[PDB]
Design a protein around this ligand. Sequence first.
Ligand SMILES: *Cc1cc2c(cc1C)nc1c(=O)[nH]c(=O)nc-1n2C[C@H](O)[C@H](O)[C@H](O)COP(=O)(O)OP(=O)(O)OC[C@H]1O[C@@H](n2cnc3c(N)ncnc32)[C@H](O)[C@@H]1O
Ligand code: NA
Lengths: 537, 86
Amino acid sequence: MKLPVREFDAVVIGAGGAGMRAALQISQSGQTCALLSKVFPTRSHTVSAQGGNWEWHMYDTVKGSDYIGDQDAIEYMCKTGPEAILELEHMADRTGHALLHTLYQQNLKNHTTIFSEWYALDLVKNQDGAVVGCTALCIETGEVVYFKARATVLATGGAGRIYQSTTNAHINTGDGVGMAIRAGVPVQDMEMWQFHPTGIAGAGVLVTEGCRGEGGYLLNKHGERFMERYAPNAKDLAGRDVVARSIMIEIREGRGCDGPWGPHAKLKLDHLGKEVLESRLPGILELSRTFAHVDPVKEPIPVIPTCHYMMGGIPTKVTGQALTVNEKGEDVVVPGLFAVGEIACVSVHGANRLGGNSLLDLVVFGRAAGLHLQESIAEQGALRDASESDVEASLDRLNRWNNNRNGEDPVAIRKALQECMQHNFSVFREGDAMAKGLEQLKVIRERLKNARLDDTSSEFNTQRVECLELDNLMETAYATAVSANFRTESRGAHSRFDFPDRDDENWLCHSLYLPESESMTRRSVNMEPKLRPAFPP
Amino acid sequence: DINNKARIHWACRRGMRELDISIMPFFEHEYDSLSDDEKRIFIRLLECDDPDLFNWLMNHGKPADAELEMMVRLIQTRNRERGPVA
Ligand SMILES: *Cc1cc2c(cc1C)nc1c(=O)[nH]c(=O)nc-1n2C[C@H](O)[C@H](O)[C@H](O)COP(=O)(O)OP(=O)(O)OC[C@H]1O[C@@H](n2cnc3c(N)ncnc32)[C@H](O)[C@@H]1O
Ligand code: NA
């Protein structure tokens, strides 16, 4: 090998709740584990989480999932959940940070090898198509290393930044998704993105529905309370699908307001008057002044639909093992590859994540991947060594950036992607506008192939990382777009204007984007719990 | 090393959207306007935990360190001066 090789049993790519819980379990099992994180682990988006009979929990989760949540996966989560959480106790709020802090401290104690500020590039395959590690760069030095592994565990989190407005930290660029896709590994339910109808425009910080509950309402650029047109009875308290969609129709048909926040609708609160706002929405007043730079007491809050959670991802078993399909359309495990957390689609969330289960799945399925790793390694058997060209294949994308100093600005490409996704593939999904959108996305991705990297330096070259992240935004966005156009029904977070109803006859199923032909197929929803009869629709 | 601007730029990538908006533009637009002492204080600030940084920026408590306080106040003042982030 020309490239330096670091060998471990497991290589965990990502140090949020999910990846750190898995790494802790792997190291506790006696096995050698490398933990990679592009940021110091306590700066994972997990840090943003706040707030802190099992069959009831299961029922709520299946129901909330609109019945494309896998019942066996959900049962495992709800039953095992409480044990899993207390195991951690036995070792803005601090709830996200404390989870990260504990898992970080434990990983060190149990001699997990931590590679903080290292950026994973692409999965390494062998001649048989098994995953045998990844290539990653040291952000401090620019050194590139092949992390050779029997098990490679993707735990990279979400990808809200495919859209213009997200609650997600800017590190959330879908790197695991891009990595899976380019390796030929499918992704599931990528149309299932949870949106909030009103985040602060230019920020993405959520503005509570309580603002509308209190009497607030939405204005377009003419000061028309436009929800009266789209929802004559419910108005600004209509379903979140309707309120969010309506805002984007308004923006895309030119009636959006604009200014330094970019395009938006105005959330008018000032008619409520000073005392009730300070009494009943004192937090919204401070959030607005700081991040919208407006005082709601006098001016409306600029808002726009905002992307929160990725229910889709790499399909997995309860064991963390990543799945694909064969030409019979049957599940078959991808040897050497695993996924845990928000990057995964085990599918405890189906069509709509339910509050608290996003922290819970991290620990339950983080741990389960670790608990079963040895058995999974035994299942896949000894994997052949990656050859030198196998490793070089995983560097190709990197090499193209490093040989293009002149060409198109990636920042502009990113903004075009995000606008396209927001206009055509967020909360307004309609067949004609999506057909155009898909073609626009092909134009944008041809431009990304002639995109420049200005900074040729090796040490702390952020621009190179940001360029590499854009390739992953582009893959995650295109998969989402193709999936969204495919599912001709409305279910949960996927709302279609041209197909407003839920269709259990044709679409009680998962969507599955197949990267080798970029085409779609379906996969069955598990309806077979072990301890409990199935919950029917 | 206050001159290693590339290193400090990476330390501005956080786990909260609110901090990305609050710190990264400040660093990009304002870091070179700072004295040598201010620059060292900003670097030490970024070692702090994300929820503390958010709270202090929101006037929900304050660090127990006079230098970090004035740096928080500085970021707040400068961020109000720049207005919404493009
Ligand atoms: C955005 C958000 C989400 C959220 C929330 C508030 C906000 C603002 N509040 C929640 C709550 O109160 N309760 C809850 O149950 N969920 C809440 N969520 C959702 C939830 O927090 C997240 O879905 C979950 O924490 C995600 O955790 P996960 O462990 O899956 O991933 P992560 O925390 O995002 O960490 C990702 C790690 O991956 C590393 N990374 C990324 N790319 C790379 C590359 N290329 N190389 C190496 N490492 C990589 C990151 O550094 C990070 O450590
Ligand atoms: Na997911």
